[PDB]
From a paper:
Internal thioester bonds are formed between the side chains of Cys and Gln residues, most likely self-generated by a favorable environment during protein folding. Here we experimentally demonstrate that thioester domains are prevalent in Gram-positive surface proteins, and that they share a conserved three-dimensional structure despite being divergent in protein sequence. This suggests that thioester domains may target distinct receptors and have a widespread but currently unappreciated role in mediating pathogen adhesion to hosts. Putative TEDs appear in a variety of domain architectures, but are almost always located at the N-termini of proteins containing secretion signals and C-terminal LPXTG cell wall-anchoring motifs.
Further, we present the identification of host fibrinogen as a covalently bound target of the streptococcal surface protein SfbI. In a thioester-dependent mechanism, SfbI reacts with one specific lysine residue in fibrinogen, forming a very stable intermolecular amide bond. Using a combination of computational, biochemical, structural and cell-based assays we reveal a novel mechanism for host adhesion mediated by a pathogen-encoded covalent interaction.
Author numbering: 66 to 270
Write the structure that this text describes.
């Protein structure tokens, strides 16, 4: 089942929402849809802004859909990781992260990682680029969860290795399966600028 919400502003007609219903605050599972249409997977593009509310909340988040590009990725990010002012490289970097992360998993980096953990890994790789999140201690990430029996040692080992592959600057060059001709993602610009702009996990027509 998908929600069907109509925006008060037709310029921002997409509903964005957190579909995670569980008890662990570490997890989110963001989606967008359009007046009851099939839904699409999304990610937070702004680490320092609020995540979309849970589906069916009394407060609803609406969005305008924009084609992804290096320009858009720069403009809608708070602190993007750009080398030598090269927005084409920023575009390539983000596209290759998404293509290799949840759900496309084009080179198997995600294999065996439970969906919510795979989203969490991919989300961290996106923030490495959108917010210049440092990620200098990947071998210790989620150790608190391991110690407390919340994520298995086995899942966390997979997650750490996947994250390292996703943030390698040579990902595009070394991955065997390359992004397809015409590959495109979308930015969702929040109608309420206290909430995150979103990045799709596939093309959203
Ligand atoms: Zn939350
Ligand atoms: Zn490398
Ligand atoms: Zn604005």
């Amino acid at each position: 089942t998908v929600p069907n919400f109509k925006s008060p502003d037709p310029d921002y007609p997409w509903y964005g929402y957190d579909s995670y219903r569980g008890i662990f605050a570490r997890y989110h599972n963001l989606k967008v849809n359009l007046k009851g249409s099939k839904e699409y997977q999304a990610y937070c593009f702004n680490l320092t802004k609020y995540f979309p509310r849970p589906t069916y909340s009394t407060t609803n988040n609406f969005y305008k859909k924009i084609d992804g590009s290096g320009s858009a990725f720069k403009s809608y990010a708070a602190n993007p990781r750009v080398l030598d002012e090269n927005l084409d490289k920023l575009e390539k970097n983000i596209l290759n992260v998404i293509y290799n992360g949840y759900k496309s998993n084009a080179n198997g980096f995600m294999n065996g990682i439970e969906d919510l953990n795979a989203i969490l890994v991919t989300q961290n790789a996106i923030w490495y680029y959108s917010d210049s999140a440092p990620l200098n201690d990947v071998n210790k990430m989620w150790e608190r969860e391991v110690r407390n029996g919340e994520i298995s040692e086995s899942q966390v080992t997979l997650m750490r290795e996947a994250l390292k592959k996703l943030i390698d600057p040579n990902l595009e060059a070394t991955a065997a399966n390359k992004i397809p001709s015409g590959y495109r993602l979308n930015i969702f610009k929040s109608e309420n600028e206290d909430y995150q702009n979103l990045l799709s996990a596939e093309y959203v027509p």
